[PDB]
Each structure stands twice: as structure tokens, then as C-alpha cells.
């Protein structure tokens, strides 16, 4: 039986098995006024998970979503903020997981979302250019300081968030909780191989991204680039050429064959997919993206397929994707 | 000789035998005239010890005692207030000791209690869904952003306890100074067995509660339940089936037996039992509850009977209820 | 030759060899005018370092060295104020060097004192009811909290001192860099032979008291107790039964045979005292006392005695005292 | 290739190259004009380190620098400030290394150039009256106090600057980033030959001063001291002098070789001398003086001289100064 609520990772951070992200979407491709709707619709859907980035639309992502949360008035208590860090600007040391970026990032996000504290601030990658000492002590200030709970590593190795965890327990500091990485049908190996070693070693836990990878799980790319749709916005040629590329038109041919598997669910591919991510109890949450009502209300109603997500059934989209990872 | 003040535990802070608690009765059973009127006939007996919780008439507690706090202006150096945190809302994250919960449910309290920091901040009860080392890492923080002098547990077993100690000195993090435990003649195994035993193993003192059992122990539940008695109320139906129990019936027909010793100490039932769960230097301080003036001055009033609780007496005692635990 | 300046202990705070103390005087025995006067003589003499208690006329006399701070307009950088904790009034839990008391007590110091830290906050004597831990920690609190720049002990046992720093590097807090110790021609041994191991061994400097013994070694008592003194003092019968006792006697007896030494070195009793005082090297500043600027500006006149202070003199002294320690 | 931003040795902090310092110009030498047209020039340049202390001009020259940025209205994220500690104040506590003047010193400092923080924080030179534990918690107190992202060591040995990371990994606590250290032509030992060692050991960088020797290496006097020349400054004797030396005389010698060699490269004398000390990668960072825009916008362009030498161009003129340091 499906948990809605769960720990992140052996945390004692509760949030929903969905959250939603803002990424793309707020303040960027979508109204102010959509914004509130979506995070209204996902407040009151019972969803208490909302991520967020200083890069997202340059800051305007989390003006936007510090102001609904403003607006709507709800108990800071009752919702988990997260945010990321690392692309903070165009200066030299506005950049990278350094003490300094850190600390001025983090003051800058917050002042934006006007909110005293984040629940998770994340390192939205991993920084080549600076020790992992120095980005563990950050991140245990900033916690120690009050500006967040937790703190958490995003496109990280397994051996990197291994290392932050060697750190923190060497100089008695603070280790990590959640690494938010990418997972869907697609993109695989790291959520179903390596995230479950480091829950059961070091307490991780596994908050996923683009669980229709950008969308084009939807099958909506099927037959071209549709108007309005994310690859057609400016910024993100990058992918439309993923999509028109040999192996993205791959990816659609197996979707077709999904597709069959979702109408005999009573399902929409999104739903089957979205479901699909949380099949598997390894996942404590999947941050879903949504550019309208429809699609939100569409992927929350991926809960109600879970149940349906048989062995028989997961086997059969193993055969389709042919993608399964070695354990 | 009786020590009217001792330490809690190993800990230097120093409190009276007798507090004075909140539970159902502040911003709940009794008007706020009528806690103000208790908590200044405590006071002003010596009493420095005065209880309560986040969860206590959802919030309300803390509200009537912050205010007569205020209202009496009675020196801060000269009150230990202490208060407990586990359910402070309806939503997910507002339950439990997790670190967010932890700081956003003492920071809410003390709001309410209009308090900088309270002396002791308790663990309600076990959480089974956070790890004790991020626990006991949110209570250190607490204390050292001085939002609490120190913590404590409540309702923990002797080995959650002892956990709390072995992650407090493997992380070099502060140890809990006390256990809330209930005890009274019909409840004595923990505190009379297992609680000794941490006191010298850890320093953890013992601060008892319910020493009447919510009133059973006053005999006034010998014939039925009288109109406005605690198990009367609206949400204690589990109060009242307890007494009514085939095993609460018992407990009235040794309290009759009880009784003939009283009247033999030239004292009430309540004052015996109080006196009776001091006899034993184990106990740093009992917690009373009280609706009116008359029961607390009566309950304070059990001092006088230690003196003449003799072993001949305790034994008696023991032979009727038959209880004793072993050592 | 003498240093005026000197490390206090093996930490980096430099005080002046001789230093003001506030007990008896400010806030109680002199006029605030009278201590404005000695104050400002002080400092313009070079002398950096004012002591004071929670205790000392009830909270009255670190608001008169406030006052006169403050008033004065002295840069704050400049000055080395300290003061020491443990009896901060009436109720049970104003006492003590518990967490609850350290940090109460010197919140409600620094209040009076109209100062944002003291340099050095003094435990002011030993407290049997709180365990070492709790105290180390608790004055490592303060410390970081930016209350005081570092930590004391007085009138502790060489022992006791030792156990604070066992305590200090075993929890890897800070250890305490001076303790307040009384030395005067009629108390000895523990300035001068456990006072220098402790330096040698963990760094603690040795700050002196009452180098007059209260001014019994001016030899204003050599006929009865001259009005005025501080012995005919309402509160102060201690002193004059000491004066007055058998050994008080004797006392004056041998003060006779030291003011044949001082008319030989041209200086007086007092002088010759103080002198004494900061002969060896291993007192770090000798706190003095002065109820008018007479006294205090003879006080000071000492540092000129030292350069006569030959071996000769010295075992001249040692026969006459007849109370050389054991080294 | 020259990377013109790197990292301050192992540390994530980002500096460019070239830094501009204040040293006898800011608040002094230069008007206020002046100064804000030279640090635009630099900034504008993609220079982000800014050098000061709170011994320049008595604070005035952090006072100047702190106008300036708060007139620019620069991103604070987009500089990295420095400032050193050591001599702050006439009173004997005023200055070195101690916990008290760490703290007060660096809290003045701050108030002066109107600045919640500094990006590094230097011990201006080493202490022999303050243990080194002390000053390395002193250190981390500020930084933990957020008053200032890292610490660094100047004018220290390599002994003494392992010592602070022994102190630092004893009882974890925060090690230095970097030395700053006087280098150029005639100062070759300590920076080509210690340091190296201590990055690869301890990760310490090098930030180096006076790549001109206060001017000398641009052969300025190499016939008398030059009217408005920082030789002829009042308080600046001890230049003077030092030119004016046989030694000083001597180097006058080589620079007219060296000036051979500039011609030679199609640059000045200046352009190699800074160029010079970029040349080998074990230098984070050279701080540049000017004392007017002509000078700093002459010194900038040593950067264009970086591809010229060669390791002919260098040996040649380690064959003029005949002080190449022993590996
Ligand atoms: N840590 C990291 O580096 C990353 C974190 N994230 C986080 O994860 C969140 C989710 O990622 P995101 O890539 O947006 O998620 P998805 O992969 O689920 O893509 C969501 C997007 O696909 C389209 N879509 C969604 N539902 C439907 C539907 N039912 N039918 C048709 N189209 C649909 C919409 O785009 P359109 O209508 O414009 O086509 C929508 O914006 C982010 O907001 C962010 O918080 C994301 C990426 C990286
Ligand atoms: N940590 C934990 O989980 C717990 C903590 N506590 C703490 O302990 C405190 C005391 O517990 P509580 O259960 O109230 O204590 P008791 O068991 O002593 O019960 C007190 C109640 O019994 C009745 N009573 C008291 N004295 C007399 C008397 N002399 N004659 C007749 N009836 C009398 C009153 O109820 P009425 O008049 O309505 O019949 C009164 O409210 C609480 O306020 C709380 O601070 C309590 C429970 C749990
Ligand atoms: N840590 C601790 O427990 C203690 C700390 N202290 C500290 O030490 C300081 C000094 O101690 P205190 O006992 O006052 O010092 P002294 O023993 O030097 O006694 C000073 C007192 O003696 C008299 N006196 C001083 N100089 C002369 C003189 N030249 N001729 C004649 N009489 C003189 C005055 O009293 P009068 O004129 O009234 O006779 C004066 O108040 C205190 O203020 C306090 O800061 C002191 C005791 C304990
Ligand atoms: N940590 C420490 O102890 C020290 C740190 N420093 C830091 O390093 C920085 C740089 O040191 P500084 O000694 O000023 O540097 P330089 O050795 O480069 O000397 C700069 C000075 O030389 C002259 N000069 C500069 N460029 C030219 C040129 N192209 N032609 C002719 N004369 C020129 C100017 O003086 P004028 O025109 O008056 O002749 C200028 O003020 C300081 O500002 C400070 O921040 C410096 C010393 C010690
Ligand atoms: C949540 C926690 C504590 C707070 C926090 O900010 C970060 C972490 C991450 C790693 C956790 C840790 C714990 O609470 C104790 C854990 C969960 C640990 C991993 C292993 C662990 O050490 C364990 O399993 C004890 O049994
Ligand atoms: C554009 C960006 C920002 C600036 C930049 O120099 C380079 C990139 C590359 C890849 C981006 C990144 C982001 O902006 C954040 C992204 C988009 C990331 C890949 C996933 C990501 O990490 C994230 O957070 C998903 O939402
Ligand atoms: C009070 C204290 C210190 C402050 C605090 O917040 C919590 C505790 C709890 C556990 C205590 C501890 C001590 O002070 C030292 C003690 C009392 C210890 C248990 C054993 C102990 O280690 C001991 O016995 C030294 O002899
Ligand atoms: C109602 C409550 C709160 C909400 C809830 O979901 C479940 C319970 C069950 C048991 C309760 C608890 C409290 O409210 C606090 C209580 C009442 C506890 C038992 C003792 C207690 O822990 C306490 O504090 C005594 O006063
Ligand atoms: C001043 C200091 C540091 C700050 C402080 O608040 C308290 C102390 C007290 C004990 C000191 C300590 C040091 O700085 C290092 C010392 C001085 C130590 C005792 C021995 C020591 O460990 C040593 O000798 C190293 O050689
Ligand atoms: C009166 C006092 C305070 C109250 C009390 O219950 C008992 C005493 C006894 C001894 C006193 C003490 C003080 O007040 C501080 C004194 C006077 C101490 C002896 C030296 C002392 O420690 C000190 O500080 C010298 O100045
Ligand atoms: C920057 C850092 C961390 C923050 C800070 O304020 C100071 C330092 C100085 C020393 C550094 C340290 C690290 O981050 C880890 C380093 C860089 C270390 C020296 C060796 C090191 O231990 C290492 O090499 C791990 O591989
Ligand atoms: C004058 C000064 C300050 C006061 C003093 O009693 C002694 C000196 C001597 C040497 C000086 C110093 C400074 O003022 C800072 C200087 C000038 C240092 C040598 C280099 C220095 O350390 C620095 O910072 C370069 O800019």
C-alpha cells in the first residue's frame, strides 16, 4: 500500500511522495496568477514539497513563489521549501559551492522568498574548484545559523556524496540528507543502483527530477515540436535537438508501445509514468513540473495507478524500454 | 530529613519536590482566574517548578501561563518553566522531533508563553520515525541558540535514554538532564527500577507526573463518576473507562484499605500518595494537578506526611497493593 | 625589572600589574563621585584592569563602574573589566554556577554594567551542587555568545581548577585562563606554591585579592578598630572579630617588626605590602582596595618599592612572618 | 595560458590575479578621488581583491575603501575584501593577536568600511604574547560569527603557519587559507621556495605584497629620491634609507640591466617586475600599490607580459640578480 507521506531518506523530514517544482515555469513561462493556482491546487491535493533554485529565471522563480506562500498565508510549518544552489550571478565568486556563495547565495535566496529558512538547501552540482571540507562547513553554518534545516547534494556521484558524508562525520559536521537526481524511464541507473546503497549506508535519501523528462514522455513530441511546448521555448534548443535527435526519436517509438500499456490501465502515459517512478519504495519523493491546471491535476492522478503496477506489468515495460540497470 | 529544593538529577538545576503542571486545566477545565490563583499559591510556597506543553489545550496552556508570568512579574531567575514538544499541528511536519519540528514547535511555545527560552524543553514521547542522533542534535542547537537552558525525555524507555546519551558522546552533542515518567501506587516499575539505574549510569533525574492517576488515587471515583470529576470531561471517555475497568475497580477497593492508613496518619488519601511517591530520594520532583485551590493546598499539604511514612508504614503499603517491583 | 604590563596567565589578555577592585567600596561604602575620582586615577596611572561581583552591594556596584565607564567616555578596547558569578540573589535558583545561573546572572551583570561583554567572567567560588561539565559548558556558552572573552575560577582548589580543564579537553571546550586567589603577608600558600604548577602545567595566570588583608596589614588596627574602618562597617563583624582574635593580635605584633623594614626602605606599610605582593613573578596583577584617593595613590606608590625588594629584604621579611611555605 | 581568476590556494574562494591594496595611498598619500578613480579602474578591470588594514592611516584608509564601494553600489558577492589585524589602538590591549583585540579589532574594522563582513581575514603579523590555540579560536569565533568568510596568515613562518593548522586539526577548529607575503625580485626565498610546500601540505596560498618593492623596482630612484616619490613621505625614513644603502644602491645596479630586458620585450620595467611574480603558478594573487591612475593602469599591463617570458627570459634574469633560492 502507498504511503503519501514518508521520510526523506532516514531524515525525520516528512514530504509527500510528489512535490512540485518551479523550474521553467515560474516566473518565467507561466503567469504570477497560474503559479498560484498550480501551488494552490498541490497545497490542497495534500502536497507539501516545493523546490526551487537561485538560478530559476534569474531569481524571479522564488519571488514568485515566496509571494503565493505570503498570500495564501499557510503555516510555514506545514510546508518543506527547498532550494538550490550554485549559479548566483556573473561575477567570479558569485558562483560555485565555496564558503562565501554559499552564505551570500543562500541570504539572497531567502530575502527573495522571504522566508527566514529553506527546509533543504541543496548544491545544485557538484563544484570541481572547490574541497569538500569547505562546502561541508558551509552548508553546517548556514544550518547552525538558522537559515536551513538541512542540506542536501543534487547531480552528485555516489562517491562525491559519500566523500560530504566522510567529511562531516571526520570533522564532527553536519552530512547530508537527500541527493535530488534525475529519474525516469529514460534515465535509470543511478536512482535504481547507487541511491539504494547510500540509503542503507549513510541515510540518503532519493528526491527525483523531470520524471517526464521535460516532457517529452508525455508522447506529446510524437510527431514534431508542438507550439507553446517546452522544447519550442526560448533558451531551450538544447531539447529540441535531444528530442529530434536519432535517440530521441527512439525514445518516442518505445513510448507508442507504453502507450498501449496506459490505455489498458485506464491511464494517460504521464500518469503511467509518474507512477512508475514511485513503484519503487526507494523514491521518497518525485518533483513533478506543470505548465497549466490540466497537466498538475493530470499527474497528481498518477497515485491511483499505483496500485496497478504489477510485477507482470513492470516486467512488460522493462522489455520495452530495455533498459534495466544491473544490480 | 526532607530537602525541600534538590538538583534534577546530576544537573545544577535546582527545584522544588512539588511543581505545579498545566495538563486539562489551564486555558481549559478552570478559567485563567483560577490558574492564576494556583500557580500564585505554588509560588508563593515555594513552589519554582511549573509545567506544560505545545500540545496542552492546543496551545492555550502555554498562553494562561505566559500571561500570569507577566501579569504576577515575577523575577525569570526565579522560575524553571519547562514545556514539551511532539504535536504542535494538524499537518505532517508538525508532529514529531524531527529537527524542523523541534525548532518551529519550541520557537511557536515560547511565542506563546511570551518566554526568551524555557529551563527544560522535553521530548513528549519516543518518535519512531526520526533518528535519535537528529534529535539530539535539534535539542543542542535549541539550548545553544538559548531557546532552552537543557532537555529532557519523557515517556522514553531506559534504553532510548541511554541511545540519547551515546549519541550525545559519540558527537560531542549536550545529553538529556531528565525523564518526565509517570508513577503512582499503580504505576511503579520504571521509575522505582529502571530510572535509578540511569541516574547513576547518566545523571538523568526523575520528574514525576500523575501522582494522583489523574484523581484515581483520591478515592472520589468510589461510587461512580462524580459530575465535573476529570473523567467527566468532554475528550477524556478513556479516562473514564479505566476507572470503570475491571482492573480500575480493583484499584478503588485497595484505595479503601489505603484509606484506614491515611486516617491513621491524620492525613487525606491524596496527601498520603503524594508523600508516598516523594519517600524515595529517586524522585527529583512530582508534578501535581489541580481544578481549585482547595485540592492543591491539600496536595501541598503531603509534605508534612513524609516524616511518618516509616518502613513499617511503605510496607504496608506494599502489602495491599501488592505491586512491588523487584530490584 | 618590572614589566608593568603582563600576560594574564599564558593567554593573550594583558593587564596592568595592579588592578581596582569595586567590593565594599562602590555602591556602598564611598560616594559614586568618590569612585568616579579613584577610577579615573587609576586609569591614568596606567592601570587597565576593574573587577567586580554580582554579589558586591547587591548589583550596585558594577552600576556605578558603569556609570563611571560610560561617563568618562573610555574606549571600551582599552579596559579589561571582569567580574565574577554565583550569589545573584534570594530565590533557589539564583545561586550557583549552573547553566540557568551563569547565564542569567551574567545577562543581568552586563545589564547593570551597561556592557555588551565582560573580558573575563569569574566563577566566584565552587559550587558543590553542579557538575563540572555543566559549568565548563555553560561558561564556553557565554564565551561564544560574545558575553565574556574568556573565563575564570576563584577560590577554587588547585584541584578543582585541574578538573575544568579535564573537563575542557576531553569536550573540547575552553579552558579557564586565571584564577582569583587571596595572597597577602598572612596567606601564602597557595599563591605561592599551587598557584605555579598550575601556570607551568595548564597556562592559569594568578589574579591576587585583598593584598592588604582587608588593611589590616596597614596597621590602622595596631590599637583597637579605628572608626570609619572597614571593620567598624555595618556587615563587616567577620573582620573585626578576626582582628581581634588571638592570631589577629599576633598578626599586629609582627606588622610592627615589618615597619621598621618599610621606614628603612623609605616606604610605607602598605607599600611595602603591595610590593610583596608582585615580588615573584608568578602573580600576574594584584587587585587593590581604597576607600579615598590617599590611600589608593600610596597604593600605587608601591611599584617604586619593588626595585629595594633584595634577596635580604625578603628572607628578612620570611623570619619575621614565620610562614615561609614548603616548595 | 594565465587564468586570470583562480583559487586562493586550496580554498573555494576566487580571486583575480592582481589585487589593488591601500597601503599609505587610501586615506593617506591620495586624495579620496583619487582613490575611487583607481579602484574603478580596477574593478572595471576585472580585479575583485581589495586589500586594507586597521592600521592604515590610522583606519582611515578602510573607511575610504568602504565609501567607495558604498558609492559604486558594487554587488557585496561580486568583491573580496581583506583586511589584517594586529596594531589597532595606543592602549596596550589594543594590539596583537589576542582573543580581545581578534574581536573588537576586527569589529572596528568592519564598522569602518561599513561592512557586515570581510572576505579574509589576515593576522597582520605573528604574536609573541598570545598562544596560538588562542588566536586560531579567535579566528574561528569571527568567522563562525559571520564577520568574516576565512582567516589567513601574513608576515608569519612556515613553522608558524603549520603551527596554526596543528592548533586547527587538534581541536577542530578552522585552518587559514593563505599567507600573505612579501614578494619580489629581491625577495625571492619564503615565497618560491616555503610556500610551495605548505599549498601541497596544508593547501595555503600565497598572496604576495609589494611587487615593487615600495617602488624601488621601477628604477624611479636610481639617481636620488624623487620629489612626491613615497621614499620622500613623511614617516617613511626607513625607505629612504634602505635606497639610499649600499644594498639599495646595488639594486639600482641590476634594474638597469633588467630595464635592458623590459626594452627588450617591448615593456617597462614595472610590467616585468609584476609579470615576474605571476610567472610560476604558486602565487594566487599579487597585490598592486598606485598612486595614480598612470601607475595601476601601467601595472595592469604587466598581464600582456606573462606570454614573453620564456625560460631563457627568465633565467636571464636570474643571471642579473643572482638570487635564485635553493630547492
Ligand atoms: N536538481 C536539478 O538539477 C533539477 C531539478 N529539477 C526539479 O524538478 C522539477 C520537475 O522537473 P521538470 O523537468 O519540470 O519535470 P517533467 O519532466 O515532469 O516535465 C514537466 C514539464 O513537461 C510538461 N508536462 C507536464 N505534465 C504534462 C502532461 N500531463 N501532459 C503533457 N505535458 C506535460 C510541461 O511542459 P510544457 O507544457 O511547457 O511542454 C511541464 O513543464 C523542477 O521544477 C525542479 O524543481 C528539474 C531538473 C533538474
Ligand atoms: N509527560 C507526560 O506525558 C505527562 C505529564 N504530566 C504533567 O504532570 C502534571 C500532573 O498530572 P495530573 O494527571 O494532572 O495529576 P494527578 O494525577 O495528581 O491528577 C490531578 C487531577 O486530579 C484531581 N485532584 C487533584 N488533587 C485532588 C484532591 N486533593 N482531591 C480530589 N481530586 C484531586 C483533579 O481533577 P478533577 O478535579 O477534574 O477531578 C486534578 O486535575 C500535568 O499537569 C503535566 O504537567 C501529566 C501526564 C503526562
Ligand atoms: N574573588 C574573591 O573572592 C575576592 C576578590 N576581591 C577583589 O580584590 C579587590 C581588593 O580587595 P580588598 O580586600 O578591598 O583589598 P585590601 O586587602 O588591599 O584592602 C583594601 C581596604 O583596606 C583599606 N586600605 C587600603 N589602602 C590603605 C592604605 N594605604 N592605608 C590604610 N588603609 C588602606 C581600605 O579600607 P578602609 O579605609 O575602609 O579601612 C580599603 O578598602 C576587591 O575590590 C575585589 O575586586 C576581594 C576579596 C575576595
Ligand atoms: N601584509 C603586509 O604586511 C603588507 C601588505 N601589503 C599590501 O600590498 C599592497 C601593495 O604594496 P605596495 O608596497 O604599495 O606595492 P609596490 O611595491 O608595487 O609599490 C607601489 C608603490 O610604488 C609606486 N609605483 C607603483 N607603480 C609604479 C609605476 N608603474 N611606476 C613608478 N612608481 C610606481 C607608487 O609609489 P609612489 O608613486 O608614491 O612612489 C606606489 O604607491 C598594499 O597596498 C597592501 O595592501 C604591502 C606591504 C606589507
Ligand atoms: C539525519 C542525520 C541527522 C541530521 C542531519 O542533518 C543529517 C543526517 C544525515 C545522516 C544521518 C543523520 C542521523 O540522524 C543518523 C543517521 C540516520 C545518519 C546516517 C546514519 C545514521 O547514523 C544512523 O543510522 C544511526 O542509526
Ligand atoms: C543553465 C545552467 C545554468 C547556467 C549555466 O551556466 C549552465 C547551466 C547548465 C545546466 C543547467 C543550469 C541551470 O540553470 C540549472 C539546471 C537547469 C542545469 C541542469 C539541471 C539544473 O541543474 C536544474 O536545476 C533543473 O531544474
Ligand atoms: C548535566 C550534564 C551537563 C549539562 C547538560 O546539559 C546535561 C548534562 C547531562 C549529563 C551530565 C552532564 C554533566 O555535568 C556531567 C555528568 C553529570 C553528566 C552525566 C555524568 C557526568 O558525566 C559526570 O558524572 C561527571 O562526573
Ligand atoms: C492526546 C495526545 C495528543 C494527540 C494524540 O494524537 C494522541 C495523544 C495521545 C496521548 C496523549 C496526547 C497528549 O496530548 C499528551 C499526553 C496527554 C498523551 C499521553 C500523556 C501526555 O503525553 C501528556 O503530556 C500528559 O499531560
Ligand atoms: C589561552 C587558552 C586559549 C583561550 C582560552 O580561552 C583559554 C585558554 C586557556 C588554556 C590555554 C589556552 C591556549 O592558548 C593554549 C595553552 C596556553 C593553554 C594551556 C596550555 C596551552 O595548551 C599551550 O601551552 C600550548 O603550547
Ligand atoms: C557574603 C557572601 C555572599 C553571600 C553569602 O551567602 C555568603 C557570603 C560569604 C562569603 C562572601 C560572599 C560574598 O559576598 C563574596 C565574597 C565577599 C565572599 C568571600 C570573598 C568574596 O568571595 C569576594 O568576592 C571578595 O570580594
Ligand atoms: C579550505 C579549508 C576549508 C575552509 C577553511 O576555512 C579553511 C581551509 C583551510 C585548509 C583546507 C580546508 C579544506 O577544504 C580541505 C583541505 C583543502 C584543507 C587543507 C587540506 C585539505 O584538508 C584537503 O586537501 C582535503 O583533500
Ligand atoms: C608601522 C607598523 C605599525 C606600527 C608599529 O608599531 C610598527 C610598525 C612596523 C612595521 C609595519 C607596521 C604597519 O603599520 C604595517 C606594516 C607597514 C608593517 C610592515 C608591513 C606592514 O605589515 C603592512 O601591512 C604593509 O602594508
Not at 63 to 78: Q, Y
Not at 80 to 108: C, P, Q, Y
Not at 302 to 327: C, F, M, R, T, W
Request: aromatic fraction near 8%; glycine fraction near 8%; proline fraction near 4%.
Amino acid at each position: 500500500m502507498l504511503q503519501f507521506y514518508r521520510n526523506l531518506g532516514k531524515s525525520g523530514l516528512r514530504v509527500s511522495c510528489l512535490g512540485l517544482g518551479t523550474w521553467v515555469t515560474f516566473g518565467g513561462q507561466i503567469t504570477d496568477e497560474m503559479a498560484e493556482h498550480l501551488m494552490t491546487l498541490a497545497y490542497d491535493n495534500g502536497i507539501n514539497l516545493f523546490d526551487t533554485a537561485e538560478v530559476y529565471a534569474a531569481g524571479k522563480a522564488e519571488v514568485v513563489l515566496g509571494n503565493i506562500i505570503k498570500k495564501k498565508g499557510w503555516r510555514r510549518s506545514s510546508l518543506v521549501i527547498t532550494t538550490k544552489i550554485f549559479w548566483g550571478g556573473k561575477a567570479e565568486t558569485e558562483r560555485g559551492l565555496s564558503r562565501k556563495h554559499i552564505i551570500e547565495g543562500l541570504k539572497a535566496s531567502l530575502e527573495r522568498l522571504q522566508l527566514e529558512y529553506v527546509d533543504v538547501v541543496f548544491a545544485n552540482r557538484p563544484d570541481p574548484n572547490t574541497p569538500m571540507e569547505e562546502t561541508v562547513r558551509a552548508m553546517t553554518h548556514v544550518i547552525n545559523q538558522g537559515m536551513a534545516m538541512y542540506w542536501g547534494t543534487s547531480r552528485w556521484s555516489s562517491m562525491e556524496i559519500m566523500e560530504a558524508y566522510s567529511v562531516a562525520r571526520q570533522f564532527n559536521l553536519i552530512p547530508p540528507i537527500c541527493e535530488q537526481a534525475e529519474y525516469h524511464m529514460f534515465q535509470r541507473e543511478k536512482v535504481e543502483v547507487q541511491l539504494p546503497e547510500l540509503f542503507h549506508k549513510i541515510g540518503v535519501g532519493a528526491m527525483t527530477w523531470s520524471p517526464l523528462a521535460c516532457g517529452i514522455v508525455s508522447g506529446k513530441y510524437d510527431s514534431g515540436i508542438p507550439p507553446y511546448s517546452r522544447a519550442s521555448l526560448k533558451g531551450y534548443q538544447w531539447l529540441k535537438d535531444k528530442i529530434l535527435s536519432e535517440e530521441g526519436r527512439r525514445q518516442q517509438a518505445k513510448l507508442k508501445e507504453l502507450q498501449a500499456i496506459a490505455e489498458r490501465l485506464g491511464c494517460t502515459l504521464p500518469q503511467l509514468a509518474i507512477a512508475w517512478c514511485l513503484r519503487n519504495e526507494g523514491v521518497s519523493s518525485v518533483l513533478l513540473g506543470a505548465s497549466n491546471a490540466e497537466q498538475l491535476m493530470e499527474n497528481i492522478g498518477a497515485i491511483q495507478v499505483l496500485p496497478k503496477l504489477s510485477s507482470s506489468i513492470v516486467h512488460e515495460i522493462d522489455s520495452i524500454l530495455g533498459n534495466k540497470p544491473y544490480s
